[PDB]
């Protein structure tokens, strides 16, 4: 079972700045701008480039103790970031691997658009839990909004 979902969120931060902060410098912001959702992000292998394995540890009381995202592509010129949840988190009997892509497209009005493409690999003939999709959407939204607030409050951070 391979299931594809697409979302298109918006932001008021310029695309270059938002990619520089939200995607590139996400290890130093997510545990700082949204500590109520992510306890700590740490590259347990690699340094952020392709093949990096980021372990994301959540605070107490969340359903999952940690997730591991295998960073696959980071295109700085087109602001593209392809990673893959491979271990921990929602990946048990049902799921196997969640291939995610985030592309930050600059809008003419000055903001930016996050085009997010997720692809779940359910084992056998299992369905994607709607609660899992909702939780992933909520986590993405809270991280994006927290980074957006960090960039709005600190107008000089990341150019």
């Amino acid at each position, epitope marked *: 079972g391979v299931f594809n979902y697409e979302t298109e969120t918006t932001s008021v931060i310029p695309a270059a700045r938002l990619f520089k902060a939200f995607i*590139l410098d996400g*290890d130093n912001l997510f545990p700082k701008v949204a500590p109520q959702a992510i306890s700590s992000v*740490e*590259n*347990i*292998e*690699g*340094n*952020g*480039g*392709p*093949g*990096t*394995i980021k372990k994301i540890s959540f605070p107490e009381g969340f359903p999952f103790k940690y997730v591991k995202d295998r960073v696959d592509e*980071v295109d700085h010129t087109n602001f593209k970031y392809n990673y893959s949840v491979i271990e921990g988190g929602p990946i048990g009997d049902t799921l196997e691997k969640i291939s995610n892509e985030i592309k930050i497209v600059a809008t003419p009005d000055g903001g930016s658009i996050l085009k997010i493409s997720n692809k779940y690999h359910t084992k056998g003939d299992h369905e994607v839990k709607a609660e899992q999709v909702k939780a992933s959407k909520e986590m993405g939204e809270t991280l994006l909004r927290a980074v957006e607030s960090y960039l709005l409050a600190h107008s000089d951070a990341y150019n």
Partner: antibody
Amino acid sequence: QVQLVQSGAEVKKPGASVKVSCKASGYTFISYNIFWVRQATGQGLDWMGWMNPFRNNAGYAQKFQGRVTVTWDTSISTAYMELSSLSSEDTAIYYCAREHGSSWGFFDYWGQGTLVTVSS
Amino acid sequence: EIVLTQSPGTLSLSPGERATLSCRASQSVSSSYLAWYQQKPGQAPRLLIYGASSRATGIPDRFSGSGSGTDFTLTISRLEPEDFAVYYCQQYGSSPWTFGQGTKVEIKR
């Protein structure tokens, strides 16, 4: 397989500048920090400076802080460490080590080590 | 800057004897991020233990790491002749990444 080969042993005059090259193969070069570790004949290990090719920057130790410059060439995938204002006490074995992770900062693969002898 | 000290300064035990090496940190090493390397006299330091408990790949099942906080121990149960080298402890729980001083495991006779 991961392989970090280095240049050959070099003799330098005091006050000159040495350049040690480390060719890294078997992994995505842009995706791993590389540290430079000096070791005297009997002294312990002391890192000099690290290069982050993904974040595209470098960070040196306070002890050296200027005499050492860490550059890289992703095309041939090599790491260059230049030591300037060499002194008679800088004769040592220099290793290039591959930092496993950006947070799991233990070096799993080291170079063979270039012996740099700085004497008059 | 976490200063690491190793004890004893130079261990010397007969082959086949349990050897215990202690690494002590000035501050606390977060999440037991200590790595034990072994350097032979003329080779690059090979990584033995990472995470202060788990052995690396291709390591014989006799190097056991333990400890946390500011006190860690590396244990070699059966000292083979390929085990008398200089053992370094490096903390990676707090930047900057700092090494130890080394314990030259000698041979008693």
